C-alpha cells in the first residue's frame, strides 16, 4: 500500500519466540491502523544489540522508528529517545509499575514505555526431585549442589551421557553480569556498585560467591557453560538434560509447548541463597519501547508503542510467551493466572528483584558491565580466584567511574 513505513527493531528471532511474536504484533498494529510496517531483526545478546543500535543512533538514522530497549539502557540511550511524557496522561502512565517508569525516566525525559519485566528464577525438574527422594527445591546453594551431585550420579548411571545438574549463563556477555549479581547478592556480597556509588564488590562474600560458581564448572554444570547464553542453557534443560536451570520466565512457556520433552515435569522458584539470612536474589531485567529521536514519523511511532504496551498485547505476551507484564492489573487477570499460576506465587520475588548498577553507572553502564562479566568469567574459566577477581574488578570499576557522578 502507501503512506509512512514504520520500521521496528526489537527482540531477536534467535531467542525463543520473542522475535517472531514481536513481528506478529507489529504486523497486527499495521493491519489494524492501515499502516505499512517492517521488522528489523537483531542479534541474540543484548550487548550486541546495543552496539548494532548505536550504529543507527550515531548516524541519526531515520531507518528505524521504534526500538525495544533493555532496562539497563535508558541512561545510555536517552539522547536518542523521543520524550514520551507529553504523549501520555498521568492516568495512562500510572497503569505501569512506578519503579519501571522511574527507571525509564532520565533527567525528566520518559525515554520509553515499560513493555515486559524480567527476573532471574530457578527452574527445577520435579519428576527428578521426586525420583531421588527430595520434596522441595533447594533453598541454599549448598542444597542445590548436593541435589545436583546425587541426581547426576544416578542419571549418568542410568545411561544419560548428556545429563547435568545445573545450567546457567556463563558466556562473557551481559547475561553473565545478571547471573553474577544474583550469586554475589545471594551470598550477602552486595550489589557490585551500590546505588550510592560505593564500589563494594571487593569483599569476602562476593569472592566466595564467585569461587562457588567456579566450582560448578565441569562438575555439576557442563564445561561448556562458560560459552552459554540464555538459549544454550535453555536447550540443555529443554531436552531433559539438566536438573536445574537459572533463566528468565520466557523459558516456562517454551518448556510447556507440545513436543517439549519436559512438558509437565518442572516448576519454578526463587534462586537459592547462601544462608537463611542472606537476601533473595533475582536480577531485574526487562524491555521498554522507545520512539527514535530520529524517526520521521513520531506520531505514528508513538501510536505503535502505546499499542504494544497495551493491556491486551501484554496479556498475549504473558499467556503465550510467559513474559512478565509491566501492568499490575494483569497479575490479577483470571486468564493470565490460570495459564501462569506461578506469576502469583513469585510476584514478591519479581517485586524485590535486584537491579544491576545501571542507574548509578548511567551512560557508562556498558563499560562497567563488561568489566564485571570479564572478571567473573575469569573465575569461571579457572584463570583467577574470586579474591583476586573482586580486587581486580574493584580497580577496573574505579577507573571507569572516576569522575562520574549520578
Ligand atoms: O525475557 C527473555 C529475554 O532474555 C533476554 O533479556 C534478558 O536477559 C538480558 C541479559 O542477557 C538482560 O539484560 C535483560 O534485561 C533480560 O530481559 C533477551 O535479550 C530478550 O530478547 C529476551 O526477551
UniProtKB/TrEMBL annotation:
Q: Which Pfam families match?
A: SBP_bac_1
Q: Does the keyword Transport apply?
A: yes
Record keywords:
Signal, Transport
Which domain of life, per UniProt?
A: Bacteria
Task: Quote the InterPro entries the UniProt record gives.
Answer: Bact_solute-bd_prot1, SBP
Extract the SUPFAM superfamilies matched here: Periplasmic binding protein-like II
Q: Does the keyword Amino-acid biosynthesis apply?
A: no
Concerning its family, UniProt says:
Belongs to the bacterial solute-binding protein 1 family.
* Official protein name in the record: ABC transporter, periplasmic substrate-binding protein
Q: From which source organism is this entry?
A: Thermus thermophilus (strain ATCC 27634 / DSM 579 / HB8)
Amino acid at each position: 500500500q502507501s503512506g509512512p513505513v514504520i520500521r521496528v527493531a526489537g527482540d531477536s528471532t534467535a531467542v525463543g519466540e520473542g522475535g517472531r511474536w514481536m513481528k506478529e504484533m507489529v504486523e497486527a498494529w499495521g493491519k489494524k491502523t492501515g499502516t505499512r510496517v517492517e521488522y528489523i531483526d537483531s542479534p541474540a545478546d543484548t550487548n550486541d544489540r546495543l552496539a548494532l543500535y548505536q550504529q543507527y543512533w550515531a548516524a541519526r538514522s531515520p531507518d528505524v522508528d521504534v526500538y525495544m530497549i533493555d532496562v539497563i539502557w535508558p541512561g545510555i540511550v536517552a539522547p536518542h529517545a523521543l520524550d514520551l511524557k507529553p504523549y501520555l496522561t498521568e492516568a495512562e502512565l500510572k497503569e505501569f509499575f512506578p519503579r519501571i517508569v522511574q527507571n525509564n525516566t532520565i533527567r525528566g525525559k520518559l525515554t520509553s514505555l515499560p513493555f515486559f519485566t524480567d527476573a532471574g528464577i530457578l527452574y527445577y525438574r520435579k519428576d527428578l526431585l521426586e525420583k531421588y527422594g527430595y520434596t522441595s527445591p533447594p533453598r541454599t546453594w549448598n542444597e542445590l549442589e548436593q541435589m545436583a551431585e546425587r541426581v547426576m550420579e544416578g542419571e549418568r548411571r542410568a545411561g544419560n551421557r548428556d545429563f547435568w545438574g545445573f545450567v546457567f549463563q556463563g558466556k562473557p556477555y551481559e547475561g553473565l553480569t545478571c547471573d553474577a549479581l544474583e550469586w554475589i547478592y545471594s551470598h550477602g556480597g552486595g550489589r557490585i556498585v551500590e546505588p550510592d556509588g560505593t564500589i563494594s564488590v571487593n569483599n569476602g562474600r562476593a569472592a566466595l560467591a564467585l569461587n562457588r560458581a567456579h566450582g560448578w564448572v565441569g562438575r555439576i554444570a557442563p564445561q561448556g557453560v562458560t560459552s552459554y547464553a540464555e538459549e544454550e542453557a535453555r536447550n540443555v534443560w529443554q531436552q531433559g538434560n539438566s536438573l536445574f536451570m537459572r533463566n528468565w520466565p520466557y523459558a516456562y512457556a517454551l518448556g510447556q509447548a507440545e513436543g517439549s520433552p519436559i512438558r509437565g515435569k518442572f516448576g519454578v522458584t526463587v534462586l537459592p541463597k547462601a544462608s537463611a539470612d542472606a537476601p533473595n536474589a533475582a536480577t531485574l531485567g526487562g524491555w521498554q519501547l522507545m520512539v527514535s529521536a530520529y524517526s520521521r514519523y513520531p506520531k505514528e511511532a508513538v501510536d505503535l508503542v502505546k499499542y504494544l504496551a497495551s493491556y491486551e498485547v501484554q496479556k498475549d505476551n504473558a499467556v503465550r510467551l510467559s513474559r512478565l507484564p509491566t501492568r499490575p492489573a494483569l497479575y490479577t487477570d483470571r486468564d493470565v493466572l490460570a495459564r501462569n499460576p506461578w506469576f502469583r506465587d513469585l510476584l514478591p520475588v519479581f517485586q524485590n528483584a535486584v537491579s544491576a548498577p545501571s542507574d548509578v553507572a548511567g551512560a557508562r553502564y556498558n563499560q562497567v558491565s563488561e568489566a564485571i562479566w570479564t572478571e567473573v568469567h575469569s573465575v569461571l574459566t579457572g584463570r583467577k580466584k574470586g579474591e583476586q577477581a573482586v580486587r581486580d574488578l574493584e580497580a577496573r570499576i574505579r577507573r571507569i567511574l572516576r569522575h562520574h557522578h549520578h
